[PDB]
Amino acid sequence: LPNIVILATGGTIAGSLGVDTLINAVPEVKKLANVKGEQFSNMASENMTGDVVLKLSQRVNELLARDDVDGVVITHGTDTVEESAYFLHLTVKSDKPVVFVAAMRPATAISADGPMNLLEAVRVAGDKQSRGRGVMVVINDRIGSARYITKTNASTLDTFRANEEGYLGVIIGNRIYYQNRIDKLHTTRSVFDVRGLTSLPKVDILYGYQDDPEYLYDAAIQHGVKGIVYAGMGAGSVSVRGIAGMRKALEKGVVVMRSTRTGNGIVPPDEELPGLVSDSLNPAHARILLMLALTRTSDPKVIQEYFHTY
Amino acid sequence: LPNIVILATGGTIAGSLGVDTLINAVPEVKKLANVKGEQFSNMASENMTGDVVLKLSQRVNELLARDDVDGVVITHGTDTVEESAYFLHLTVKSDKPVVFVAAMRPATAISADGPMNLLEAVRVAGDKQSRGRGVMVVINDRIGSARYITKTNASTLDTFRANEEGYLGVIIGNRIYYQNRIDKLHTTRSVFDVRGLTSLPKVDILYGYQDDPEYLYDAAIQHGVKGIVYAGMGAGSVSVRGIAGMRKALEKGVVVMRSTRTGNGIVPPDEELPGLVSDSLNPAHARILLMLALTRTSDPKVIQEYFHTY
Amino acid sequence: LPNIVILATGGTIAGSLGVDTLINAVPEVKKLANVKGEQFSNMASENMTGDVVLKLSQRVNELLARDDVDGVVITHGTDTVEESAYFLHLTVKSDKPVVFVAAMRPATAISADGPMNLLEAVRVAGDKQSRGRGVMVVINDRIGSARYITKTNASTLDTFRANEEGYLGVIIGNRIYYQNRIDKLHTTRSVFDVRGLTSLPKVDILYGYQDDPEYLYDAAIQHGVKGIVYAGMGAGSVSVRGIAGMRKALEKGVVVMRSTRTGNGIVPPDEELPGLVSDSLNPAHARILLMLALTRTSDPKVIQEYFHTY
Amino acid sequence: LPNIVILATGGTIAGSLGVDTLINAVPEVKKLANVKGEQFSNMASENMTGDVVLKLSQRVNELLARDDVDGVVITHGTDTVEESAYFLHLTVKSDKPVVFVAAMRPATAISADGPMNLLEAVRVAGDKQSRGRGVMVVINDRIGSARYITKTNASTLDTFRANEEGYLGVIIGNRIYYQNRIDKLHTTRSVFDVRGLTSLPKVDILYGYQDDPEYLYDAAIQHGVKGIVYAGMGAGSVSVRGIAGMRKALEKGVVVMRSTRTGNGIVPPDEELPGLVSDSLNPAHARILLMLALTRTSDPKVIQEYFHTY
């Protein structure tokens, strides 16, 4: 049996202490692997901070470096699991399976989804075929790449999707079907190393819409953000106001990253406009990447290249 | 043949002034109806402003009250057309068709989509079956409701979609197939009358995400916003910093609307959280409804109901 | 509280007879209404037959004509529920809610979806706002119209979808949100009355695909089918072999309905091809409408209109 | 510049002789590569036969074996392009790009899509990064794997999709963005060799629905089909009739493959039922694979393994 450690970052996703009420809630899990529960942190994912995500990443790198650990499963709130997951997707230097699992319904609710999600997560974490596939998010019978997956619906069980990238694999009838391998850098082939890191750069996200305010750029600049991700209109389009706001930020050495608020797609290069473009990274993902990029360089050209390859 | 007035708000979406380059680029349109072209404004949809959308709404109410006008087609940029169309969805007091048409590829590009989207738009605007359906957005053989449709992809022609609500109808083989009638208030049954208004209450949208800063709330507040739409994590989840920013906003007379960044779904009521909830209006749609709501009242009970019924 | 009759057609979708295991498995249901359980039939939906669906339709018309019955919930297998539900969509002459509920995971499975789907189904059936919406299929927090909904995936819980038409509504946080009203004929406004019928005209579905054989047409014909629904390539495209098979069918009194295997969309009229076109009814829905149509007439002009209006 | 040969299998997809009217319709193509037009065959894809697909596969293998050919582009009707493409996906022993391209609108129609599709196809065919990605189908800015892509809508421009597998890459702003590499065997790592093959086994497809006829199995058996692909209900579910029909076929040495009519998903193994299961192959794909499998063996276990790895 695989040795899999399950790290909890909040309350239980299955069962009625903490990561243990969970490990007991689903017995069948002990047939897939010899599990070990660890309550790494404990809060609503909307309260998950880069500092904790950074600790989580270091903890997991540490665990995976040992031979008595075959893979890691992380229970996490669904709201920002995509942010936390993409962070480790870029900072865990191991081919060992790293699976984030979440639930849309409380563990006490009727037809709660946590129990089946955990089981699937553990199955995927211990399966030999799961190696070297980057960080994954398992829920609702699907396996999504941390780089593509995102919560697309506020409240439905099937919320996680990668509309244009699809899923890596699915788990049907207790069998894992692997469909794709993502064509991007990650985990073992990533330049973002978190060994010795203590904090991350400040990157805020500004929305683009009709009449968007130029003053929020100022506020961001005045609070010393090292980077600004712009959840732009359409393909990162910027209004005159947003442009004056970006030009201003670019003078102060702030890195401007143009993404989209649409939800999917490529924000293509465009020299007529300020900042860099996010490729197919959505705002939440673009922010995690922009931060890690800055722990390496401030060179606009190198960062752009990261965004086209990570 | 129907009398359709084509209103342009930017450059031409068909052909190589402006609204006439457009009307002559697709002669086939003169077969579906008698068209008159009016260049209402001229700028990229990312620079379209509430003040102008306001004038558009009045210009459209004015045209539709005329016996020699059976419907209106409005060419608009794809980036914010959902904002503008929804604005008119709530303010045009007529059952005559109001069809916004856009184009994802430049008029002079290879396989430009504008010619066809315009033809379908005119056909929809002139069809007698199109009456009383609310404002529509026509593009890529589909007819979406202004209340549900949104640009889901940055650069694809099939970008417009209402994942959970579908399309009101479609146009295949030069024929309109009507599938749905939205079960919401709009146009002739809407209480929002902006006849005479010059400016609308200021509403900003703040993003929800790990480490989101309280200071962005302080900034919007200090600049006099009257309402803040929150593109929250998951179902309008708020961090301790966003909650503090929301309470500060409430203590300063700013109305708070909790939406979601996910892109789809329902943000449910939560007695344990501050502010109102957006039902299924995404951030961009929510901002439009809240602005209009604030010209009428600041009563949270009343505004909440608007968001459950419009 | 509403009076809801739960009709079972197979085993229980909730709990560990049959319809009572079900009603006692989800006590919360007794809170939404007063339920009476009736085991109508008992077999897997892949073995559900037109003759039984016919009896179900009459049993449902019978119950709904009673003042002590406010609505009906019908448990059914997921495999052919779209066929059965659409049958009742066209034959139940009542505005009272008729909600089919299914479950993708066995009742005793980990994270079984039946308990919740049943609760939502009962809530939808009993809500006063649910009247006059046509037959509904409730599962996975969604309410799809019997006319558009279809099982799009073999094994996932989110299998039910109407890609182009969306859901009539959804159930989030124990609340129903109604998004659409289908713009089609059904129930109280349907001409299809099957009161008293025992058997329906025989209709087969033949697939369209490279090298498809003419002999399958000969076979259906020789066995006395009255109608052939063609799950064609693309927009009901036919090969020279399928055309020959269709002409043979026409020369033998079999009505030909051209649909599509793609899974979505409109099959448009084509004067240059044989047979009728299915509008946007998929093969399985088309078969149901054609059978019912044939109990009324064989007039192609009339049947074509049914397919554009039901 | 890459040397790319464009093989036409029908009329032109762009422009107003044959593959030449097409090569002239889009000049920009000559900037991406030194192209050579060849009219391989000439008919409506719904009339495409395995014999021709087999010739096409041999022709392309022959072309790719030369150094003066860098990649191949095949214009094809949209109705069965997925069948033809999957065939070469399994029989072209080269890492050289093989791109199938199609158009949904006639080349003379307004906003015809062929011109942009061709250009994108050629770009993808000549780009060095496109090597070893299996056969691809380019249309509507998307790059889909022949193994996953399918026509999901009868008439819309965005019809091609792999709902659960997503696209391999997309082409936005004249730049190719590669997202996934499929995790299946194909082209250079495929055991299906067509060198010397003259014909393919007979495989027909039978639909599964309420009241499905057992006689079509007999008809298929009596016409000597070597294989039967079953577009089953839900997850390849079989009614009593279909089971008697399969048992009958299994006695006569016919290979029974259970797929689904739903459109997506896994048909899982199930020993309680007859035949083999198609994994995530849809009927059209399962038929192409079943035929090629039979040109190698009739062993039920080896064929099943093919279906879980190809």
PDB file of C-alpha atoms in Angstrom, chain C residues 111-240:
ATOM      1  CA  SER C 111     -21.726  10.178  -1.277  1.00  0.00           C
ATOM      2  CA  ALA C 112     -24.919   8.956  -2.928  1.00  0.00           C
ATOM      3  CA  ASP C 113     -26.704  11.783  -4.751  1.00  0.00           C
ATOM      4  CA  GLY C 114     -30.209  10.362  -4.412  1.00  0.00           C
ATOM      5  CA  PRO C 115     -31.094  11.730  -0.984  1.00  0.00           C
ATOM      6  CA  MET C 116     -30.521  15.341  -2.065  1.00  0.00           C
ATOM      7  CA  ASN C 117     -31.992  15.006  -5.593  1.00  0.00           C
ATOM      8  CA  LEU C 118     -35.172  13.668  -4.011  1.00  0.00           C
ATOM      9  CA  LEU C 119     -35.396  16.509  -1.514  1.00  0.00           C
ATOM     10  CA  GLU C 120     -34.937  19.107  -4.291  1.00  0.00           C
ATOM     11  CA  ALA C 121     -37.476  17.255  -6.420  1.00  0.00           C
ATOM     12  CA  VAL C 122     -40.075  17.330  -3.686  1.00  0.00           C
ATOM     13  CA  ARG C 123     -39.347  20.997  -3.012  1.00  0.00           C
ATOM     14  CA  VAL C 124     -39.754  21.822  -6.687  1.00  0.00           C
ATOM     15  CA  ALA C 125     -42.904  19.756  -7.018  1.00  0.00           C
ATOM     16  CA  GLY C 126     -44.480  21.482  -4.040  1.00  0.00           C
ATOM     17  CA  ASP C 127     -43.481  25.073  -4.809  1.00  0.00           C
ATOM     18  CA  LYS C 128     -46.400  27.170  -6.049  1.00  0.00           C
ATOM     19  CA  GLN C 129     -44.063  28.879  -8.506  1.00  0.00           C
ATOM     20  CA  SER C 130     -43.440  25.549 -10.218  1.00  0.00           C
ATOM     21  CA  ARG C 131     -46.843  25.366 -11.910  1.00  0.00           C
ATOM     22  CA  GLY C 132     -47.233  25.454 -15.706  1.00  0.00           C
ATOM     23  CA  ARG C 133     -43.569  24.880 -16.487  1.00  0.00           C
ATOM     24  CA  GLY C 134     -43.915  21.545 -18.273  1.00  0.00           C
ATOM     25  CA  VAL C 135     -42.352  18.333 -17.071  1.00  0.00           C
ATOM     26  CA  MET C 136     -39.105  18.753 -15.180  1.00  0.00           C
ATOM     27  CA  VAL C 137     -36.102  16.584 -14.413  1.00  0.00           C
ATOM     28  CA  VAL C 138     -34.477  17.401 -11.106  1.00  0.00           C
ATOM     29  CA  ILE C 139     -30.986  16.260 -10.252  1.00  0.00           C
ATOM     30  CA  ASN C 140     -27.657  17.846  -9.149  1.00  0.00           C
ATOM     31  CA  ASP C 141     -29.182  21.112  -7.938  1.00  0.00           C
ATOM     32  CA  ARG C 142     -30.600  21.738 -11.439  1.00  0.00           C
ATOM     33  CA  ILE C 143     -34.101  21.755 -12.917  1.00  0.00           C
ATOM     34  CA  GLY C 144     -34.045  20.875 -16.621  1.00  0.00           C
ATOM     35  CA  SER C 145     -36.969  20.924 -19.047  1.00  0.00           C
ATOM     36  CA  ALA C 146     -37.979  17.448 -20.262  1.00  0.00           C
ATOM     37  CA  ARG C 147     -37.849  18.853 -23.822  1.00  0.00           C
ATOM     38  CA  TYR C 148     -34.167  19.943 -23.660  1.00  0.00           C
ATOM     39  CA  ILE C 149     -32.481  17.933 -20.917  1.00  0.00           C
ATOM     40  CA  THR C 150     -30.501  14.829 -21.777  1.00  0.00           C
ATOM     41  CA  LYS C 151     -27.935  12.535 -20.145  1.00  0.00           C
ATOM     42  CA  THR C 152     -24.727  13.922 -21.750  1.00  0.00           C
ATOM     43  CA  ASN C 153     -22.228  11.787 -19.808  1.00  0.00           C
ATOM     44  CA  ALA C 154     -22.166   8.071 -19.090  1.00  0.00           C
ATOM     45  CA  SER C 155     -21.110   8.196 -15.479  1.00  0.00           C
ATOM     46  CA  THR C 156     -20.837  11.658 -13.917  1.00  0.00           C
ATOM     47  CA  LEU C 157     -23.244  13.221 -11.385  1.00  0.00           C
ATOM     48  CA  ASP C 158     -23.374  16.420 -13.535  1.00  0.00           C
ATOM     49  CA  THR C 159     -24.391  14.332 -16.574  1.00  0.00           C
ATOM     50  CA  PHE C 160     -27.721  16.119 -17.136  1.00  0.00           C
ATOM     51  CA  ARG C 161     -27.391  19.228 -19.278  1.00  0.00           C
ATOM     52  CA  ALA C 162     -29.069  21.290 -21.984  1.00  0.00           C
ATOM     53  CA  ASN C 163     -25.975  22.856 -23.499  1.00  0.00           C
ATOM     54  CA  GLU C 164     -27.861  25.272 -25.750  1.00  0.00           C
ATOM     55  CA  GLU C 165     -30.987  25.814 -23.656  1.00  0.00           C
ATOM     56  CA  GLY C 166     -29.806  25.726 -20.064  1.00  0.00           C
ATOM     57  CA  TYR C 167     -31.884  24.889 -17.050  1.00  0.00           C
ATOM     58  CA  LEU C 168     -35.347  26.120 -16.233  1.00  0.00           C
ATOM     59  CA  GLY C 169     -33.873  26.839 -12.844  1.00  0.00           C
ATOM     60  CA  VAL C 170     -31.651  25.691  -9.991  1.00  0.00           C
ATOM     61  CA  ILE C 171     -31.912  24.899  -6.275  1.00  0.00           C
ATOM     62  CA  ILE C 172     -29.210  26.523  -4.134  1.00  0.00           C
ATOM     63  CA  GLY C 173     -29.232  26.856  -0.370  1.00  0.00           C
ATOM     64  CA  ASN C 174     -32.639  25.179  -0.178  1.00  0.00           C
ATOM     65  CA  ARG C 175     -34.078  27.868  -2.463  1.00  0.00           C
ATOM     66  CA  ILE C 176     -35.411  27.587  -5.978  1.00  0.00           C
ATOM     67  CA  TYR C 177     -34.202  30.077  -8.557  1.00  0.00           C
ATOM     68  CA  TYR C 178     -36.232  29.997 -11.782  1.00  0.00           C
ATOM     69  CA  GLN C 179     -34.257  31.159 -14.811  1.00  0.00           C
ATOM     70  CA  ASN C 180     -36.276  30.160 -17.864  1.00  0.00           C
ATOM     71  CA  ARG C 181     -39.683  29.174 -19.162  1.00  0.00           C
ATOM     72  CA  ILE C 182     -39.421  27.037 -22.338  1.00  0.00           C
ATOM     73  CA  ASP C 183     -40.941  28.635 -25.376  1.00  0.00           C
ATOM     74  CA  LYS C 184     -42.659  25.459 -26.531  1.00  0.00           C
ATOM     75  CA  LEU C 185     -45.969  23.646 -26.348  1.00  0.00           C
ATOM     76  CA  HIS C 186     -46.552  21.129 -23.572  1.00  0.00           C
ATOM     77  CA  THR C 187     -48.962  19.692 -21.016  1.00  0.00           C
ATOM     78  CA  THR C 188     -52.227  21.663 -20.823  1.00  0.00           C
ATOM     79  CA  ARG C 189     -51.578  23.128 -24.279  1.00  0.00           C
ATOM     80  CA  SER C 190     -50.579  19.862 -25.961  1.00  0.00           C
ATOM     81  CA  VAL C 191     -52.787  18.119 -28.494  1.00  0.00           C
ATOM     82  CA  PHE C 192     -51.430  14.688 -27.618  1.00  0.00           C
ATOM     83  CA  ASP C 193     -53.999  12.735 -25.621  1.00  0.00           C
ATOM     84  CA  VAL C 194     -53.128   9.095 -24.962  1.00  0.00           C
ATOM     85  CA  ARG C 195     -56.088   8.382 -22.689  1.00  0.00           C
ATOM     86  CA  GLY C 196     -56.976   4.761 -23.357  1.00  0.00           C
ATOM     87  CA  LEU C 197     -54.173   3.847 -25.779  1.00  0.00           C
ATOM     88  CA  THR C 198     -52.468   0.530 -25.074  1.00  0.00           C
ATOM     89  CA  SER C 199     -49.647   0.507 -27.586  1.00  0.00           C
ATOM     90  CA  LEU C 200     -47.795   3.112 -29.630  1.00  0.00           C
ATOM     91  CA  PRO C 201     -46.617   3.050 -33.268  1.00  0.00           C
ATOM     92  CA  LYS C 202     -43.247   1.354 -33.669  1.00  0.00           C
ATOM     93  CA  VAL C 203     -40.295   3.732 -34.097  1.00  0.00           C
ATOM     94  CA  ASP C 204     -36.659   2.761 -34.464  1.00  0.00           C
ATOM     95  CA  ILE C 205     -33.557   4.903 -34.447  1.00  0.00           C
ATOM     96  CA  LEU C 206     -30.804   4.152 -36.970  1.00  0.00           C
ATOM     97  CA  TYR C 207     -27.331   5.660 -36.597  1.00  0.00           C
ATOM     98  CA  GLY C 208     -25.555   7.709 -39.247  1.00  0.00           C
ATOM     99  CA  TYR C 209     -21.829   7.091 -39.759  1.00  0.00           C
ATOM    100  CA  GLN C 210     -19.212   6.272 -42.452  1.00  0.00           C
ATOM    101  CA  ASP C 211     -20.139   3.081 -44.307  1.00  0.00           C
ATOM    102  CA  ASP C 212     -23.556   2.909 -42.616  1.00  0.00           C
ATOM    103  CA  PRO C 213     -25.539   0.023 -44.175  1.00  0.00           C
ATOM    104  CA  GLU C 214     -28.708   0.199 -46.224  1.00  0.00           C
ATOM    105  CA  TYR C 215     -29.824  -3.224 -44.866  1.00  0.00           C
ATOM    106  CA  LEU C 216     -30.628  -1.842 -41.435  1.00  0.00           C
ATOM    107  CA  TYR C 217     -33.366   0.203 -43.102  1.00  0.00           C
ATOM    108  CA  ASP C 218     -34.671  -2.924 -44.866  1.00  0.00           C
ATOM    109  CA  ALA C 219     -34.741  -4.758 -41.548  1.00  0.00           C
ATOM    110  CA  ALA C 220     -36.713  -2.132 -39.597  1.00  0.00           C
ATOM    111  CA  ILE C 221     -39.088  -1.796 -42.549  1.00  0.00           C
ATOM    112  CA  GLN C 222     -39.657  -5.515 -42.836  1.00  0.00           C
ATOM    113  CA  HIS C 223     -40.442  -5.708 -39.128  1.00  0.00           C
ATOM    114  CA  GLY C 224     -43.191  -3.164 -39.479  1.00  0.00           C
ATOM    115  CA  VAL C 225     -41.809   0.015 -37.967  1.00  0.00           C
ATOM    116  CA  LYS C 226     -44.102   2.970 -38.623  1.00  0.00           C
ATOM    117  CA  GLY C 227     -41.354   5.532 -38.245  1.00  0.00           C
ATOM    118  CA  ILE C 228     -37.570   5.663 -38.371  1.00  0.00           C
ATOM    119  CA  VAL C 229     -35.629   8.297 -36.470  1.00  0.00           C
ATOM    120  CA  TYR C 230     -32.219   8.885 -38.052  1.00  0.00           C
ATOM    121  CA  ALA C 231     -29.370   9.894 -35.655  1.00  0.00           C
ATOM    122  CA  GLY C 232     -27.491  11.443 -38.540  1.00  0.00           C
ATOM    123  CA  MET C 233     -24.034  12.696 -39.231  1.00  0.00           C
ATOM    124  CA  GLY C 234     -23.911  16.455 -38.631  1.00  0.00           C
ATOM    125  CA  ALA C 235     -27.134  18.239 -39.591  1.00  0.00           C
ATOM    126  CA  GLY C 236     -29.008  15.045 -40.508  1.00  0.00           C
ATOM    127  CA  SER C 237     -26.673  14.401 -43.470  1.00  0.00           C
ATOM    128  CA  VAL C 238     -27.357  11.102 -45.209  1.00  0.00           C
ATOM    129  CA  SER C 239     -25.029   8.866 -47.252  1.00  0.00           C
ATOM    130  CA  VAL C 240     -26.025   7.395 -50.616  1.00  0.00           C
TER     131      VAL C 240
END
